[PDB]
Amino acid sequence: MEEAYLALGKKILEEGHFKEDRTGTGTYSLFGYQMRFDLAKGFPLLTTKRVPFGLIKSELLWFLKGDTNIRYLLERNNHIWDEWAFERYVKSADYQGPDMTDFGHRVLQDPAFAEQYKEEHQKFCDAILNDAEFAEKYGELGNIYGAQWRHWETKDGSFIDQLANVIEMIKTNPDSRRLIVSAWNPEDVPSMALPPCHTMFQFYVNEGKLSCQLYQRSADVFLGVPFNIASYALLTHLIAHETGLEVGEFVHTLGDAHLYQNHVEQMQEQLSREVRSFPTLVLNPDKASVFDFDMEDIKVEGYDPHPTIKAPIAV
Amino acid sequence: MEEAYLALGKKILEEGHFKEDRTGTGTYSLFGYQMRFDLAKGFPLLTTKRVPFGLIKSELLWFLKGDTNIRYLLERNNHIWDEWAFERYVKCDAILNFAEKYGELGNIYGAQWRHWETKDGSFIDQLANVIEMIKTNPDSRRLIVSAWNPEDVPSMALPPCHTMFQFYVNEGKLSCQLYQRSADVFLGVPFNIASYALLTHLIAHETGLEVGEFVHTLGDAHLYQNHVEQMQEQLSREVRSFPTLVLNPDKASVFDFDMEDIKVEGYDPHPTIKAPIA
Ligand SMILES: Nc1nc2c(c(=O)[nH]1)N(C=O)[C@@H](CNc1ccc(C(=O)N[C@@H](CCC(=O)O)C(=O)O)cc1)CN2
Ligand SMILES: O=c1ccn([C@H]2C[C@H](O)[C@@H](COP(=O)(O)O)O2)c(=O)[nH]1
């Protein structure tokens, strides 16, 4: 239920202590929490603010195809992963523009700086889309989600298709208590742009229904959790479709649950608004595998949220 | 609190749906559960039945030291591996007094925690690294130890039940959350609570911190159908205060702790309740 996500934000505002963080922004933080969404009551795309479903769709199809380079995302006008690739490029020996140290805070404080950032980010997006060599080197985020889900590398010259394996297991061993996918690969963590926020997840079958639990080590509550929720709920529906099952519950478990301190006014404005009905998900019935779905095969119908509430991403 | 454990038992007896399992025994199960233990309130070794802290501590020190050979356990009267290692051989004093040959137990917690193999043939020490990160960078959201390698899982007889755990530091207190994919709620969960609360206290000791909370997250939480009468007996008994953990103050590093260095004071449980392993 949406009220479950809104009660987490209110608990952080009330009693989550201040914790300095890697980004330099500052957060209010709790440790250890659990929410549940019954997917039979509606698709959990939040209605108390507008959440863009097409960016959640394109990000998950990107994961599912095993891709860890942002060119696919830019082709679909999805810029949610741009920051970390831009930071990689401004730190390299090839960047020749104005200094971009600490650009993620500087843009909020200094209009002259903000215009130079906007200029350099444009030139970056154009180069990824138009120069294949530039994209191959500077679009690359390392072995994040797509690579661990489809291509966990072995010590003997091969790779494990972890996500296709677990879908198969659901079909022939549905009571198995080892239906797990992990993106936590210790050997690859240091070279990933960021280590996986949404860390490992497990499926469960009973009485013809599929359920999924996620363990999320680090949750940005205002900007990232509404995307996370909707992404794992879509993944659970696609798998249920291929395996011929009905949908059960998504259980979301958090580690460090944090509100960044420059999202507090946004959270308070969200908390003032009346919840509406969740929308319904519609999937193309003639697609058989999760891997065959494309953008036009997936939609939400009946979505009528309250207005967008903008907030800055912590880099 | 102990009541939060007993509440999980009672919920599965009332609402757990019937669900078949690997062993062919019946179970009543729920998916997704979370319990909190505030370690300032007492050390969570259950009072409503006796739980053997001796086997928990020899097993936990064995893993911490990255040891994987049973000699260590046998010396400390923990037999939870005896038959298997003999069965390996058939294909016990000599282990104590041949041990290097017939006494090794491969791909288990100690090795994944302190010797995770990489593609080039070197090894990551996850637990040493996380201790050093607690000391230098306590606000880190990446304080993670994983036991789950998909390259290894398909060939082992029991893939890890304790798939990964995470630490957290605030106001000078250390907390730990465990993700446990599969929980036998009568027999395994009481042992599991104590193990991971003890690990939270040993790490807080090594890092100069006080204790916060142990948060226990469950995937498939199940009562075996032949443990129902035992759970019902336990639920009829009055809860008592948890005992107090005492660690040896005169030893800096826990990597030099042994059995005599870890004690529980004030433990006053109701009697042992017997049941079968599935
Ligand atoms: N700080 C932070 N970094 C992170 C995450 C996170 O949740 N928080 N992620 C966690 O998985 C990944 C990125 N996910 C993101 C999700 C949403 C938006 C975002 O800015 N949403 C805005 C604007 C959307 C739009 O472009 O229209 C919004 O929802 O209003 C950014 C990154 C990697 N890095
Ligand atoms: O420390 C332990 C070890 C084992 N189990 C139980 C959980 C399951 O009943 C069984 C393992 O069976 P699978 O989940 O792998 O089927 O052992 C625990 O609860 N805790």
Numbering used by the authors:
A (entry chain B): 1 to 315
B (entry chain A): 1 to 91, 125 to 130, 134 to 314
What does the paper say about this structure?
In cells, TS provides the only synthetic source of dTMP necessary for DNA biosynthesis. TS works as an obligate homodimer, having residues from both enzyme subunits that contribute to substrate binding in each catalytic site.
The structure of EfTS in complex with the substrate dUMP was determined to be 1.75 Å resolution. While subunits A and C where dUMP is bound display the open conformation, subunits B and D where 5-FTHF is bound are in the closed conformation. The cofactor-analogue (6S)-5-formyl-6-tetrahydrofolate (5-FTHF) is entrapped in the active sites of subunits B and D by the same tight network of interactions already observed in the substrate-free form of the enzyme. The most evident rearrangement concerns the flexible loop 18–26, which moves towards the catalytic cavity in the dUMP-bound subunits, exposing Arg22 inside the phosphate recognition pocket. The movement of Arg22, whose Cα shifts by ~5.8 Å, is fundamental to create the four-arginine cluster that anchors the dUMP phosphate in the substrate site.
